[PDB]
């Protein structure tokens with residue numbers, strides 16, 4: 001297991017999100033679905049000139065999986081996935097130009113929904129999750145797990161769980177006061193409100209239901 005420090009302003013932002021009350025938390029799901037959609041676009045365009053890039057799975061889609069027993073909401077996609085280097089670089093160690101401006105905007109009363117416009121959309125996960133685990137598989141790298149409960153660092157390790165062919169799974173270990181995001185109707189209404197124009201199928205597990213479509 002390897003441990004990495006978040007870039008200082010990203011650590012500051014995470015602390016702010018965790019320790020300051022914001023309403024409109026539901027936008028975390030929009031932000032994670034947008035990341036899945038971007039990752040799906042990436043592999044889709046790569047496959048146009050190299051169809052073998054889909055040998056690890058031709059289906060391009062997003063699954064939403066609430067688990068009441070474990071108190072987790074998982075967002076799974078069959079997108080491009082992240083290499084080990086991608087995880088380390090893109091999910092915490094590299095500065096984002098908009099972080100300080102976003103924190104200033106929040107102090108001045110901006111809605112937390114603006115997070116994506118400032119280039120730090122992923123960190124919305126910490127509005128509702130005490131811990132986030134990201135399991136990811138990119139072509140020509142092994143499967144990896146990134147994890148953080150905030151507090152300034154994250155870990156990366158090779159994953160020995162169930163193999164994914166290709167893509168990313170973001171596992172949200174929800175705070176005890178945010179279990180509404182495990183409910184079928186709640187998830188449906190947030191997807192309808194915020195993610196209605198995503199151009200890939202989105203499936204909800206309750207047994208299994210295509211949204212919606």
Ligand SMILES: Nc1ncnc2c1ncn2[C@@H]1O[C@H](COP(=O)(O)OP(=O)(O)NP(=O)(O)O)[C@@H](O)[C@H]1O
Pocket residue numbers: 031034035036038039077079080081082090091115116117118119120121122123167168
């Ligand atoms: N599901 C995923 N699949 C592949 N890469 C991902 C996924 N989620 C996040 N990433 C990577 O993590 C980076 C940071 O995500 P994020 O903080 O959401 O910023 P962003 O998507 O680049 N810009 P924005 O969300 O519009 O503020 C992305 O740019 C990707 O490189």
Ligand SMILES: [Mg+2]
Pocket residue numbers: 031034035116121122
């Ligand atoms: Mg994003």
